[PDB]
Amino acid sequence: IGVKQLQREIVLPGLVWTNPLTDFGGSKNDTITVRVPAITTANRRDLRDPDRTVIASELVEHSFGVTLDKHVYAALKFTDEQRTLDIRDYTKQVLMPQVSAVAYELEDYIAELIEGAPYEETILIDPADTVPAFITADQRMGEANVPTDSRRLVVGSAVAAALAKDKQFRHADWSGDQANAALREAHVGRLAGMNVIRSNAIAPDKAYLWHRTAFILAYRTPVVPEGAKAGASFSANGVALRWLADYDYSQLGDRTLLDVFTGRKVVTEVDGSFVRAVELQLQASSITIVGGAFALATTTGTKQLKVRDDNGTDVTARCTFASSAGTKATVSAAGLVTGVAAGTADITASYVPPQGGTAKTATVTVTVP
Amino acid sequence: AYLWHRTAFILAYRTPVVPEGAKAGASFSANGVALRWLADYDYSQLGDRTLLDV
Amino acid sequence: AHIFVKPELVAEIGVKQLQREIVLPGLVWTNPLDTITVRVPAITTA
Numbered sequence: 262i263g264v265k266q267l268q269r270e271i272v273l274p275g276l277v278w279t280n281p282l283t284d285f286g287g288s289k290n291d292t293i294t295v296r297v298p299a300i301t302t303a304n305r306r307d308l309r310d311p312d313r314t315v316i317a318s319e320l321v322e323h324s325f326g327v328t329l330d331k332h333v334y335a336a337l338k339f340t341d342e343q344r345t346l347d348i349r350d351y352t353k354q355v356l357m358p359q360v361s362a363v364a365y366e367l368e369d370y371i372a373e374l375i376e377g378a379p380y381e382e383t384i385l386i387d388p389a390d391t392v393p394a395f396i397t398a399d400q401r402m403g404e405a406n407v408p409t410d411s412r413r414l415v416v417g418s419a420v421a422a423a424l425a426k427d428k429q430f431r432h433a434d435w436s437g438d439q440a441n442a443a444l445r446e447a448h449v450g451r452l453a454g455m456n457v458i459r460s461n462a463i464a465p466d467k468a469y470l471w472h473r474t475a476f477i478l479a480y481r482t483p484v485v486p487e488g489a490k491a492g493a494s495f496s497a498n499g500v501a502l503r504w505l506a507d508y509d510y511s512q513l514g515d516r517t518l519l520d521v522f523t524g525r526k527v528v529t530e531v532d533g534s535f536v537r538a539v540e541l542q543l544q545a546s547s548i549t550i551v552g553g554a555f556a557l558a559t560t561t562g563t564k565q566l567k568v569r570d571d572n573g574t575d576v577t578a579r580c581t582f583a584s585s586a587g588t589k590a591t592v593s594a595a596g597l598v599t600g601v602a603a604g605t606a607d608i609t610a611s612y613v614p615p616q617g618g619t620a621k622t623a624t625v626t627v628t629v630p
Numbered sequence: 631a632y633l634w635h636r637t638a639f640i641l642a643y644r645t646p647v648v649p650e651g652a653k654a655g656a657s658f659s660a661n662g663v664a665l666r667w668l669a670d671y672d673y674s675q676l677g678d679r680t681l682l683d684v
Numbered sequence: 685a686h687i688f689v690k691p692e693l694v695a696e697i698g699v700k701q702l703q704r705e706i707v708l709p710g711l712v713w714t715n716p717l718d719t720i721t722v723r724v725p726a727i728t729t730a
Contacts, residue, residue: 289692296689321687486678488653488669507673510651516673636713644717661709664716 271364272460273371274498276413279478285329285524286481292326297531299323323531327524329479333370334520335362341515356495356504359519364497367523372462374476374525375415375469381534384541385616386420386468388572391427395453398470398539405536411473414455419466419543419574421459424449466545466574466615471538479524495519545570545614547621548580554626557590557600562630566596568610568623580612581620590629600629643684658682 285291299322304315337359339348348354384401386394395414402412416424430436430443443449449457455470463469483503485492491506500521508515529535551567568576582592585607590600592608600606606627613620645664648654652670659665668681 294689294691317685319685319687322689324689486669486671487655488671488678488680490653505671505673507671508651509673511674518673638713640713640715642715642717642720661706662714663709 268361269365269368269461271368271498272415272458273368273375273462274364274478274500276415276458277371277374277476277478278473279500280480281477282327282479283481285479290328291330291524292328294324294326296322296324325526325529327477327479327526329481329522329524331370331523331525332520333363333366333523334518335359335366336519337517338514339517341513344515355517359504359517360495360497360502363502363519363521367498367500367521368462370523370525371476371478374478374527375471375538376463376467376540378476378527378538378540379529379535380538380540383615384539385544386423386541387544388423388426388546390429391420391424392429392453394541395455395468398468398541399453399455401539402470402472402536407472407537409454412455412470413458413473414452414468414470415458415460415463416468417463417465417543418459418461419572420468420541421449421457422447423543423572424452424457466543466572468541468543469538470541475528475537477526477528479526481522483520483522491517542615543572543574544616545572545574545576545612545621547571548576548610548612548623550608550610550623550625554628556628556630557598558630560600560603560629563597563599564627566592566598566608566610566625568596568612570612570621576612580610583609583611585609590627598627600627603629605629645684655680660684 282293282295285293288294299320301318301320304318306315337355339355384394384398403409424430425443425447427443428435430438430449431441433439433441433444436443451457480500482494482501485494485503485505489505489507491504493504495502495504502519502521504517504519506515506517527535528537530537548568548570551569555564557564566577566582568580570576577596580596582594582596584590584592584598586605587601589602589604590598590606590608592598596610598608606629608625608627610623610625611620612623643663646666648666648668652668655667655669657664658667663684665682665684668683669678671678
C-alpha cells in the first residue's frame with residue numbers, strides 16, 4: 262500500500278571519472294594505452310670551468326593501460342507459467358527492480374575500486390576533534406602537487422555523524438555559523454575546503470578524498486544481437502545498459518538479461534606510488550554489545566550478536582568472540598551464539614582498534630533457558 | 631572444356647522459410663539464387679549465430 | 685636514451701585475398717521450386 266523495502270541511495274557513479282576514452286574495441290586485448298607527457302631535468306656547471314662537457318638529459322614518456330575486464334549482468338529466469346498471471350505490469354515489477362539491481366552493482370563496483378586502492382597509510386580521525394584529520398588529508402594531497410580543483414570527499418554515515426557531533430561544528434561560537442546547521446540540522450556541508458558527500462556504499466567509518474584523475478571507470482553497452490527477439494537500451498545512473506530477452510524453448514521459459522561491460526583503473530604515478538587519493542578512518546576507543554544481557558528462546562536457541570563501538574559502527578564482522586562457559590553456550594566467529602545447556606554464560610568480544618594496540622573488550626551475559 | 635545445350639543441366643533451388651524461433655534479417659542472394667539469412671541468439675552460450683542457406 | 689610511446693598502426697591499402705571469378709552460375713538452367721517433374725512430349729512413327 263506504499264511500504265517499500267529500505268534500499269541505499271546512489272551517489273558514487275556521478276563522482277568518478279567515467280568514460281574519458283571509449284574505443285576499447287579498436288585495441289588489442291581491449292587495453293588502451295594512455296601515455297603521460299615526459300618531463301626532464303636540468304644540470305648545473307661552474308663558470309670558467311676547464312671541463313667543457315655537458316650532461317645530456319632525456320625525455321622518456323611513460324604509459325599505463327586501461328582495460329575492460331568485467332561484465333555486470335542481472336539475469337532473470339521466469340517461466341511463462343508466471344508471466345501472464347503473476348506479474349501485472351512488466352515495466353514496474355521486473356524491469357525496474359532489475360535496473361535498480363544493476364545500478365547498485367555498478368555502485369558496489371565503484372566502491373570496491375575506491376576502497377581497494379593501494380593507499381600507503383590511513384589518516385586517523387579523532388572523534389573529539391575531527392578537523393585536524395581532514396586538514397591533514399588536504400595537506401598530504403598537497404605535498405604530491407595534486408591540483409586543488411575537482412577534488413571529491415565522500416564520507417560514510419559514521420564520519421558524518423561524528424562531524425555533526427563535533428563541538429567544532431556544533432557550537433556556534435567555535436564555528437561562526439550563527440545558525441548551527443550542525444545542530445538545527447545534522448548537516449556539515451563545507452569542511453577544510455572540501456564539500457562533504459554522505460554515502461553508505463563505502464564502509465561506514467571511513468572517508469575518501471580523491472582528485473578527479475585518480476580513478477577511471479570505462480563502460481560499454483553490449484550491442485543488441487540481431488538474433489534476439491527483444492532488445493532495449495535502458496539507462497541506469499547515466500550508464501546505458503543492454504536489455505535482452507530470449508524465449509528459450511529448452512525449458513519453455515523466457516529468460517531476460519540486463520548487462521553492461523565495465524572496467525576500472527587506479528591512476529598510479531610513474532613510480533608506482535598512489536598519491537592522487539587519501540583515505541581516513543574514524544578512530545575507535547571502546548566497544549559494547551547491543552541489547553546487553555539477554556536470554557535465548559530455547560536451550561538450543563540461537564541469537565545473532567551485534568557489536569557497536571562508541572562511534573556506533575557495526576563492528577560485528579571485525580570482532581573475535583569467545584565464550585567463558587562453552588559447556589552451556591558457545592559463540593560463533595560471526596557473533597552468532599548457540600546455547601547447548603541451560604544456565605548463565607559470559608561472552609567476550611575483542612576488537613583491535615583501527616590504530617594498533619591492545620584490543621578493546623566487551624563482556625556480556627547470556628542466560629540460556 | 632564442356633559444350634552443352636541449355637536444356638542439359640538443370641539446377642533447382644529453394645529458399646527455406648525463416649523458423650519461428652529465429653529472426654528474419656536482410657534479403658541476401660547469390661548470383662541469381664536467392665539465399666536465406668537467419669539469426670538466433672543463444673542465451674545458454676551468451677552468443678549469437680547467423681546462417682546463410684539454400 | 686629517449687623513449688616514446690607509440691601505437692601500432694593498422695591500415696588497409698587495398699591488398700586483399702585473391703578469390704575466383706564467378707562465371708558458372710547463370711549458364712546452367714535454373715528453377716526456383718520438394719520436387720519438380722518434367723513433361724517431355726511423345727513422338728511416333730508413320
